[PDB]
Design a protein around this motif. Structure first.
Motif, short mmCIF file in Angstrom:
data_model
loop_
_atom_site.label_atom_id
_atom_site.label_comp_id
_atom_site.label_asym_id
_atom_site.label_seq_id
_atom_site.Cartn_x
_atom_site.Cartn_y
_atom_site.Cartn_z
N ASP A 148 26.55 36.12 -14.09
CA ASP A 148 25.60 36.99 -14.75
C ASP A 148 25.93 38.47 -14.65
O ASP A 148 26.01 39.14 -15.68
N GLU A 149 26.13 38.98 -13.44
CA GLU A 149 26.01 40.41 -13.18
C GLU A 149 27.03 41.22 -13.97
O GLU A 149 28.14 40.76 -14.23
N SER A 150 26.63 42.43 -14.35
CA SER A 150 27.54 43.40 -14.95
C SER A 150 27.16 44.79 -14.46
O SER A 150 26.14 45.34 -14.88
N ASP A 151 27.98 45.35 -13.57
CA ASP A 151 27.80 46.73 -13.16
C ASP A 151 28.35 47.73 -14.16
O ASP A 151 27.79 48.82 -14.28
N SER A 152 29.42 47.38 -14.88
CA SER A 152 30.07 48.29 -15.82
C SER A 152 30.50 49.58 -15.15
O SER A 152 29.82 50.60 -15.24
#
Lengths: 178, 42, 49, 102, 50, 423, 123
Positions: B1-5
């Motif tokens: 899931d995660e997206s820090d970008s």
């Protein structure tokens, strides 16, 4: 280059006189300590005094903390700014952790630490944080080889506290924050 | 899931995620904390 | 004047803070029944002060 | 007269009989007397009822006296009211002290 | 009346000495001194009980 | 390991499969409202019909039980057993229970609620299978006979040994014991998990919030001795503070205000921590009671803040955000209020930020100075900053009036500053 | 300062009192607190009574001088309750106190001199 010395004397009963000395001795102001029947020692601290004597008249400051240590073991701590301007003051705090006769009131040169010490029994010394007016609670424990303290001496700059007991030995402690 | 970008809300989370010591040290603020002495016998 | 004198003025201008001690909060467990949480905040503030 | 008396009496004032019997034969004194039915004790529980009876009795002595003799009275029960605050606090803190281990 | 009063003083003495003994028991830093006519007494060190 | 040890393990596993008639009588007898003899006699049909009625009244009072009526109280839910459905279904059904308990934690002062949770407790064995969340949700209720009954029924999970010694006492447990409980740490972790869940569902209320915040307060109270334990307890309470800030309920933000003020006055912290805290508090500041409480809290935060540069200028974005939320009128009102809580360090950093940033509301600055009393060192600092602004910025009559005010009050320190720098 | 206690000592006589009471309590021949003084007065053992003219309200010991008048025992006030406390040797304000009777004390002469002084004032 201008200052003035104010003697502050204390009869046992609880009456405190304050003379000046520049002009020949007159009574600048007289007041009654609250309570304190058997009063034995008085000290002042925080500015400059006979325990942190300054170096040049430029280094002379005006003192802030007044301590009246009284015979049953009590200490009443006073703030000069309003004690003087009320002329029948109220104690700012009372310290009575000690239980025996009071002999030595002294301060650190800063006036941040009030060292009080009795003289009638071993382990009879404590340090007090100001302006909280609260006794410190991690020293001295039951493993502090104090003995009957009779003289309390800080040093001006280094941060040492030398305490001298009856058995014939002084002992050193160095404070780190200084 | 995660997206820090305008104030955010995750500042505390991030700063406590960063810092390892909270009773401050770097200060030596020429003041003496209550109820704890730093004393060494000599 | 000198830097140590500034530090002394700093210590002098410092004012005292009523500290917390381990049993200075039970009266709220006492008066927690049906009072407004704003009033509760007031309570904690005046217990500190 | 009632204010003339001291605190311990106003505690013990009812069960004077058992008191005197205990005194004249070296058993142990009673503790409640007439102040049993005081509502404070009426919520207290056991040894706590005893302690609360004692403290309430003392405060009762104070309040009794002040209502009794004071030349200048507000008739509003201020001393009694603050006293009730005091004993209420002492009670609930004592109650909260539980005696077992946890 | 006379034996009332003398019994009264005797009981006063008994109660006084017996409370001296109680005090002996309670607490503090006692000291036992033999006063000159040869009579015991107790003095407590100057100490404020907390 | 001991044979009896492993068998006790197995029993703790299998404590609910109604293996025999005797153990069926025991299990099915454990229940809330009724006394044991009846709770053994009566039947599923009786329990369920009454419970369905109770759900009806409770859905009338609060309309959001409806889906629970849909699922947790169906004639199938008479039929179904728990002890044979597979684990996926078990996690499902536990999730449903958690939802129900979260909702029902708010209305416990109602016999209909009592009957509904009674049906649950005797049909699903919630008093053995979801005890952690049950006790947490009901925990703010501990003088009442409902907590009595529920404690007496339930075997207590290892995190509740206090209540374990209180199981069927005569008198309610006391806040002293409960505070011991919360003074334990892992229990706090579990509680924070619970409060995060409760907040994210946004169903919180006065009693629970008051109780829990008072409990944290007393935790840092009893911990105030060993600054280490606080040096490791900081995170838990800070994250719960932030997540309460995340809410939209002024109650949650002011509860966070409270927990922050206590923690900050019980530990000396870092300026970065303090300013970040103030920033987020402000950022989610919405209500006006929250406005007042946040003002008091920020003031106290700065006043207890101690270190090098206690009067440094407030950072840029923080300063603009603070002005936006509190234009100067609110500040002057709070100041000329007669309570007078010490807030001078906040005042001074505010003024330094104004001078270094705004350069226009100098008459507000002088009004504030005329309104509150200050201390020598920060007065010197403000004067020095004003000297910088005089030497850089074009001369201003307001700046001249500021210098004039200092001359009227404490010109000599101004002279010392000038001799340090200038003619 | 309170217009309710009639006999109130000066600084000198206050000093004399608080000294005698120090040595008395140091022997434990002194009983403390208003209730206990009341007991002793009814016991007829009370050598005499010290009171504290700064207890709020003042009635809560104002009652005693009734007993004192009745039983012909000296009673005086001193103006500082915290003083009387740290004098008698405890950790609290002590609104009242009473010195008891014991002829075996080493302080009979002091106790009669002082009670002579208080009689002088009272009469």
């Amino acid at each position: 280059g201008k200052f003035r010395t104010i003697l502050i004397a204390v009869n046992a009963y609880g009456e405190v006189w304050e003379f000046d000395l520049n002009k020949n001795g007159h009574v600048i102001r007289r007041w009654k300590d609250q309570g304190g029947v058997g009063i034995t020692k008085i000290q002042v601290g925080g500015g400059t005094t006979t325990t942190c004597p300054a170096l040049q008249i430029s280094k002379i400051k005006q003192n802030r903390w007044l301590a009246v240590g009284s015979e049953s073991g009590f200490v009443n701590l006073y703030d000069r700014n309003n004690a003087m301007t009320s002329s029948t003051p109220t104690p700012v705090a009372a310290l009575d952790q000690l239980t025996t006769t009071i002999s030595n009131l002294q301060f650190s040169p800063d006036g941040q630490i009030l060292c009080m010490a009795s003289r009638a029994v071993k382990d009879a010394l404590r340090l007090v944080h100001l302006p909280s007016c609260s006794v410190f609670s991690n020293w001295p424990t039951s493993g502090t080889p104090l003995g009957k303290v009779t003289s309390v001496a800080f040093s001006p700059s280094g941060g040492l506290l030398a305490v001298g007991n009856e058995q014939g030995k002084v002992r050193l402690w160095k404070l780190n924050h200084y | 899931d995660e997206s820090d970008s305008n104030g955010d809300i995750n500042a505390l989370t991030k700063i406590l995620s960063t810092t390892y010591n909270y009773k401050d040290t770097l200060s030596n603020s020429k003041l003496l904390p209550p109820k704890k002495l730093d004393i060494v016998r000599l | 004047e000198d830097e140590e004198d500034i530090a002394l003025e700093f210590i002098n201008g410092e004012k005292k803070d009523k500290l917390v001690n381990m049993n200075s909060f039970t009266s709220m467990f006492d008066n927690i029944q049906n009072v407004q949480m704003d009033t509760f905040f007031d309570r904690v503030m005046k217990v500190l002060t | 007269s009632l204010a003339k008396s001291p605190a311990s009496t106003i505690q013990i004032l009812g069960a004077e009989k058992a008191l005197f019997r205990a005194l004249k034969t070296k058993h142990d004194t009673p503790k409640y007397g007439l102040l049993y039915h005081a509502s404070l004790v009426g919520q207290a529980t056991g040894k706590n009822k005893g302690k609360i009876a004692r403290v309430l009795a003392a405060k009762a002595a104070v309040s009794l006296r002040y209502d009794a003799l004071a030349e200048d009275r507000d008739d509003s029960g201020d001393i009694g009211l603050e006293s009730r605050a005091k004993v209420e606090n002492r009670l609930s803190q004592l109650e909260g002290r539980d005696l077992r281990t946890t | 009346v006379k034996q009332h009063l003398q019994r009264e003083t005797q009981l006063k003495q008994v109660q006084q000495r017996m409370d001296a003994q109680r005090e002996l028991l309670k607490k503090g830093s006692k000291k036992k001194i033999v006063d000159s006519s040869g009579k015991i007494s107790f003095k407590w060190k100057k100490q404020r009980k907390r | 390991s001991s044979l009896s040890d492993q068998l006790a393990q197995v029993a703790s596993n299998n404590a609910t499969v109604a293996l025999d008639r005797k153990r069926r009588q025991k299990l099915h007898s454990a229940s809330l409202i009724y006394n044991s003899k009846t709770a053994a006699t009566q039947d599923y049909d009786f329990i369920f019909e009454n419970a369905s009625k109770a759900l009806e009244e409770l859905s009338q009072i609060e309309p959001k039980f409806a889906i629970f009526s849909r699922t947790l109280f169906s004639e199938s839910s008479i039929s179904l057993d728990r002890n044979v459905q597979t684990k996926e279904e078990i996690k499902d059904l536990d999730n449903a229970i958690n939802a129900y308990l979260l909702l029902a934690s708010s209305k416990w002062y109602l016999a209909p609620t009592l009957h509904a949770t009674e049906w649950l407790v005797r049909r699903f064995q919630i008093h053995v299978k979801n005890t952690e969340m049950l006790l947490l949700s009901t925990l703010n209720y501990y003088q009442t006979p409902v907590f009595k009954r529920i404690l007496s029924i339930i075997k207590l999970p290892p995190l509740f040994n206090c209540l374990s010694n209180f199981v069927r006492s005569e008198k309610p447990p006391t806040a002293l014991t409960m505070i011991k409980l919360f003074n334990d740490m892992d229990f706090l972790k579990l509680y924070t998990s619970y409060l995060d869940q409760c907040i994210k569902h946004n169903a919180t209320y006065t009693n629970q919030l008051l109780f829990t915040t008072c409990c944290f307060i007393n935790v840092v109270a009893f911990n105030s001795n060993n600054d280490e334990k606080l040096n490791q307890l900081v995170p838990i309470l800070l994250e719960i503070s932030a997540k309460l800030l995340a809410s939209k309920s002024k109650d949650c933000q002011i509860a966070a205000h409270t927990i922050l003020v206590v923690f900050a006055t019980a530990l000396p912290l870092k300026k970065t921590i303090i300013l970040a805290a103030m920033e987020t508090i402000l950022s989610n500041l919405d209500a006006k009671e929250a406005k007042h409480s946040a003002l008091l809290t920020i003031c106290k935060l700065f006043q207890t803040l101690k270190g090098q540069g206690n009067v440094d200028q407030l950072p840029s974005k923080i300063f603009k955000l603070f002005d936006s939320k509190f234009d100067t009128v609110s500040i002057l009102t709070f100041l000329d209020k007669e309570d007078k809580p010490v807030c001078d360090k906040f005042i001074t950093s505010y003024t330094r930020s104004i001078a270094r940033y705004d350069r226009s509301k100098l008459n507000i600055i002088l009004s504030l100075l005329k309104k509150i009393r200050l201390e020598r060192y920060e007065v010197r600092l403000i004067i020095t900053d004003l000297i910088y602004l005089s030497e850089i910025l074009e001369d201003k009559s307001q700046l001249v009036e500021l210098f004039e005010y200092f001359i009227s009050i404490n010109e000599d320190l101004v002279l010392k500053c000038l001799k340090s720098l200038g003619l | 300062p309170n217009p309710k206690a009639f006999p109130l000592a000066d600084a000198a006589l206050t000093q004399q009192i608080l000294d005698v009471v120090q040595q008395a309590a140091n022997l434990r021949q002194l009983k403390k607190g208003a209730n206990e003084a009341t007991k002793t007065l009814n016991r007829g053992i009370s050598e005499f009574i010290i009171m504290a003219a700064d207890c709020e309200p003042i009635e809560i010991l104002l009652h005693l001088p009734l007993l004192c008048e009745d039983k012909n025992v000296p009673y005086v006030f001193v103006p500082s309750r915290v003083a009387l406390g740290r004098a008698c040797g405890v950790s609290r304000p002590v609104i009242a106190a009473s010195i008891t009777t014991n002829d075996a004390s080493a302080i009979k002469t002091q106790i009669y001199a002082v009670k002579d002084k208080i009689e002088t004032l009272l009469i």
